[PDB]
């Protein structure tokens, strides 16, 4: 309940402060992973089949920096808002919501 | 490509429930009126000249 509720509140009520903090975090996760030789190899290898040959590392902070909270909120709604979630659990799931409940959990009339 | 009529309708009016309600409020209005107009007409056709509407002529203003 709390999860989907955080999704929803993200695409309709993002605050600049909030996004701002989550911004910074991303910087760090994405700098700190690159400490060491093996991690840096990976970034390079994979990065060239993924994103092609680019090494977007320094751009990142620029791209990351382009995020005004509106950006984060419109981006968020495309994927989350009224999209049918894909769900999987492994018992005891007896309390795991019904698919229809999860689904309506994707829009905001109340809850 | 263009959005199916539905998809157009969808992204213009239903994404936001606020818009979705609004829609419903306005359609509830427009629809009443056509329904009544059509439905009434239909009915009145089935009883041509049976109803006062049809018959007020005889004793009206001479």
């Amino acid at each position: 309940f709390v999860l989907q509720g955080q999704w929803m509140r993200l695409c309709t009520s993002a605050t600049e402060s909030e996004v701002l903090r989550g911004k910074n975090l991303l910087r760090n996760a994405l700098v700190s992973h690159l400490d060491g030789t093996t991690p840096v190899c990976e970034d390079i290898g994979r990065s060239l089949l993924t994103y092609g040959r680019r090494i977007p590392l320094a751009e990142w902070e620029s791209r990351i920096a382009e995020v005004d909270a509106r950006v984060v909120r419109e981006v968020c709604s495309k994927y989350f808002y009224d999209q049918c979630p894909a769900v999987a659990g492994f018992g005891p799931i007896e309390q795991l919501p019904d698919y229809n409940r999860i689904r309506s959990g994707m829009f905001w009339l109340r809850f | 490509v263009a959005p199916t009529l539905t998809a157009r309708l969808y992204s213009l009016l239903f994404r936001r429930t606020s818009t979705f309600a609004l829609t419903i409020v306005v359609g509830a209005l427009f629809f009443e009126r056509a329904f009544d107009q059509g439905a009434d007409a239909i009915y009145e056709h089935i009883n041509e000249g049976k109803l006062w509407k049809h018959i007020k002529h005889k004793y009206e203003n001479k």
């Binding site: 909120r73 | 936001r16 606020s18 309600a21 609004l22 409020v25 209005l29």
Partner: peptide, 22 residues
Amino acid sequence: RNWVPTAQLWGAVGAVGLVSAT
């Protein structure tokens, strides 16, 4: 935030509702 927009459509709805309904 999104409240003004949404409060504005919610205010619209009540309005047209009364107007028509009533």
